[PDB]
């Protein structure tokens, strides 16, 4: 209309890219830390210029990220002021908001300073929450007009959890496979990074040897040939054994429900089973009728009747009676599945 909507969408769009420019400059730090540690583990010492350059690139890409975070928060406050009638930047500052802001800056401010270089490097796998902020913005459910038009009648909330629940519901299985195969190479680098700054050798300080322990601990087997010694491995084993003692049941339920049943195609199968042998009781009926006629025929005729020819037919007559009841049981039971 002019200063109504319009400008609001523009401010939203210019806020959206700030949470997207903080993902590249957040994952670049992790990549450089991993590369630097893996290269320095058995190569040039601290005196080399690589340990001075690659340890300052991270210190720069960790200053740019916290430069961007403040601007993103300022854009959020500006959207709050635009949406809700107010003209002061002090109105929208609750204790919870400022506490969350300081916590975010503290968490994103951890980086090795150009031993303790592993203590200050393990908790850098905490910038992985930015994926949630990227995903809640790159979704058409939270960015559309028909969505809100048909969802305003039911006063639901589009949190960072409703999108996750919908994504779990409509695309299950894959959201568990990615989560369970992108956690091995996060919880198996940590174990060796913890046991290499400590009592060395063993077999947990070798990649693909630490993906065996995590794979037989995630899976609830355990052997005992490889057990962590330091407290880092001893503490991450039961954190990969908790997430994995309740993640191997969801996938089993999904497998059980996936393509192992149907709803509208079972009517055809029920009709086929009804028209099959369950409707072949005529066979048993004819058997009983012909047997009971033949018994009389060969017991009241043919001069003298031998006992064998009578008793054979009579034994098979008693054989052919319970078969009719057995098929009638299934005939009556099939109607219980049509309710």
């Amino acid at each position: 209309i002019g200063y109504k909507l319009g400008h609001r969408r523009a401010l939203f769009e210019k806020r959206k890219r700030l949470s997207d420019y903080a993902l590249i400059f957040g994952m670049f730090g992790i990549v450089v830390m991993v590369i630097e540690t893996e290269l320095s583990w058995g190569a040039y010492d601290k005196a080399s210029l690589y340990s001075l350059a690659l340890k300052c690139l991270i210190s720069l890409s960790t200053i740019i990220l916290l430069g961007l975070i403040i601007v993103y928060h300022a854009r959020e406050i500006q959207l709050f002021m635009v949406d809700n009638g107010a003209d002061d930047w002090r109105i929208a500052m609750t204790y919870e908001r400022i506490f969350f802001i300081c916590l975010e800056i503290l968490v994103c401010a951890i980086h090795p300073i150009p031993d303790v270089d592993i203590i200050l490097s393990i908790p850098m796998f905490l910038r992985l929450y930015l994926i949630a902020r990227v995903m809640l913005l790159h979704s058409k459910l939270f960015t559309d007009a028909s969505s809100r038009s048909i969802g305003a009648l039911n006063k639901i909330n589009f949190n960072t959890r409703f999108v996750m629940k919908t994504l779990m519901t409509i695309c299950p299985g894959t959201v568990l496979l990615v989560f369970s195969i992108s956690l091995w190479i996060i919880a198996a680098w940590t174990v060796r990074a913890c046991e290499r700054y400590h009592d060395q050798q063993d077999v947990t300080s070798n990649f693909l040897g630490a993906m065996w322990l995590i794979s037989i601990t995630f899976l609830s087997i355990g052997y005992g040939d490889m057990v962590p010694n330091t407290y880092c491995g001893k503490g991450v084993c039961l954190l990969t054994g908790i997430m994995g003692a309740g993640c191997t049941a969801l996938v089993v339920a999904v497998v059980a429900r996936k393509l192992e049943l149907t709803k509208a195609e079972k009517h055809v199968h029920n009709f086929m089973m009804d028209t099959q042998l369950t409707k072949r009781v005529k066979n048993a009926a004819a058997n009983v009728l012909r047997e009971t006629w033949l018994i009389y025929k060969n017991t009241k005729l043919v001069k003298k009747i031998d006992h064998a020819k009578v008793r054979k037919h009579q034994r098979k007559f008693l054989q052919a009676i319970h078969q009719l009841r057995s098929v009638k049981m299934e005939q009556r039971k099939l109607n219980d599945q049509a309710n």
């Binding site: 005529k282 066979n283 048993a284 009926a285 058997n287 009983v288 012909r290 025929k297």
Partner: protein, 142 residues
């Protein structure tokens, strides 16, 4: 026969669906005891089931008739009810007038399909009810 210590069981079994204990069972009580179990058959089916229990035809069943019906009392799976149940599959529209062609077709096309000397032999021993109709009565020879 069994002494009074083995007759209270039958007395309470009879009283299960006797309720008021008037000495006579009616189709109302039979419906009350049958609809509880889940099945809901037609009252005509109730009459059909109640026809083959008594000989006087009074429409009510006394204790001796119920006792001689219960005389089966488990392990009585023989030609008592199956011989009658294996007749509706070939019933001539509920009239007991099955044609010879229909009987021959049921004997030959469906079942063991025995040899000609045993399939075309339906004419043999068919002299029972020589008028032309074949009702349920010829099973007396069995």
């Amino acid at each position: 026969q069994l002494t009074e210590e083995q007759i209270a069981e039958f007395k309470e079994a009879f009283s299960l669906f006797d309720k008021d204990g008037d000495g006579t069972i009616t189709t109302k009580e039979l419906g009350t005891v049958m609809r509880s179990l889940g099945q809901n058959p037609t009252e005509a089916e109730l009459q059909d089931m109640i026809n083959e229990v008594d000989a006087d035809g009074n429409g009510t069943i006394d204790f001796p008739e119920f006792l001689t019906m219960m005389a089966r009392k488990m392990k009585d799976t023989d030609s008592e009810e199956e011989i009658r149940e294996a007749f509706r599959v070939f019933d001539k529209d509920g009239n007991g007038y099955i044609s010879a062609a229909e009987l021959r077709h049921v004997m030959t096309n469906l079942g063991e399909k025995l040899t000609d000397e045993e399939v075309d032999e339906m004419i043999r021993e068919a002299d029972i009810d020589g008028d032309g109709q074949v009702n349920y009565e010829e099973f007396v020879q069995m």
